[PDB]
Amino acid sequence: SFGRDACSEMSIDGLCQCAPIMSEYEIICPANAENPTFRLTIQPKDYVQIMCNLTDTTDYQQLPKKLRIGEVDRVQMRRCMLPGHTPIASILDYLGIVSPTTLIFESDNLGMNITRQHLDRLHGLKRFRFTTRRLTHIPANLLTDMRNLSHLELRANIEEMPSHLFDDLENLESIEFGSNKLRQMPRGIFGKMPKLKQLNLASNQLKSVPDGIFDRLTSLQKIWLHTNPWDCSCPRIDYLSRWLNKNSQKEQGSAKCSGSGKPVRSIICPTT
Ligand SMILES: *[C@@H]1O[C@H](CO)[C@@H](O)[C@H](O)[C@H]1NC(C)=O
Ligand SMILES: *[C@@H]1O[C@H](CO)[C@@H](O)[C@H](O)[C@H]1NC(C)=O
């Protein structure tokens, strides 16, 4: 585990400087640099933040060596690059970060397309947040083996969602897919979700949803569908209008119609 003694040792060799600030530790890599490659914030056994400023993936050599942070709950990686075709878990391993419950990877400088390999050796993760302003295509295998995952947030201007994205992810409790550019939803995307309580599909580009999309969401408590250009023509909006009327208590905010602006829940489709 990383402490005051481990922090003191770093300020002798000169590779990286450590400073005991408040109840945590601020690590600057390289030490004495105006614009450091790494800015680490370590609050022992609780939280570890990695503030990056890399021109290329090669700069990961500037990371503190022989560092043994140990067990940490939350890991926040801001502006960091994917270490090529190597898992993000390697950066965690190099720093001695053991069994993280949460991982937040926010970066507009990824350098490449996020693959299943970047998320490898992270099957024990409970919470995962991946944010990028850049146009990102998500593969179907990306979240495989992430079976212990209960919270997932993906804000990446994603246009299409692969159908087998949540294949063998039954422990999921919360999904945040807000402020993406999603036009569609696959038919059996939320098939095996017996533990999902919260689902956020707001601020997307959804005109419709396939019939029965939320029927297998038995544990659902909250749902966000607002700020979507919902096509409220019948019989297309029937399932969603009926579902949002029956599960009005679950709806957070109000999903409105493209033309009128009337809540989707207030639309009553006829039978023909
Ligand atoms: C990142 O590093 C470059 C030099 O490579 C520097 O010009 C820039 O100001 C740095 N940015 C931040 C936010 O530190
Ligand atoms: C990611 O992959 C897609 C094809 O699946 C490609 O069109 C896109 O340009 C790639 N992204 C980057 C940043 O190269």
Numbering used by the authors: 28 to 299
The authors write:
It is the founding member of an important family of germ-line-encoded pathogen pattern-recognition receptors in mammals, the Toll-like receptors (TLRs).
The atomic structures were determined for both native and derivative forms at 2.4 and 3.0 Å, respectively. According to their respective solvent content of 62 and 59% for the native and derivative crystals, the latter were expected to diffract better. Either incomplete substitution or the additional handling during back-soaking was detrimental to the quality of the derivative crystals. However, I3C binding at the concave side of each protein, interacting with charged residues of the leucine-rich repeat region, modifies the packing of the second molecule by tilting it along its long axis by approximately 40° compared to the native structure. This in turn increases the crystal symmetry.
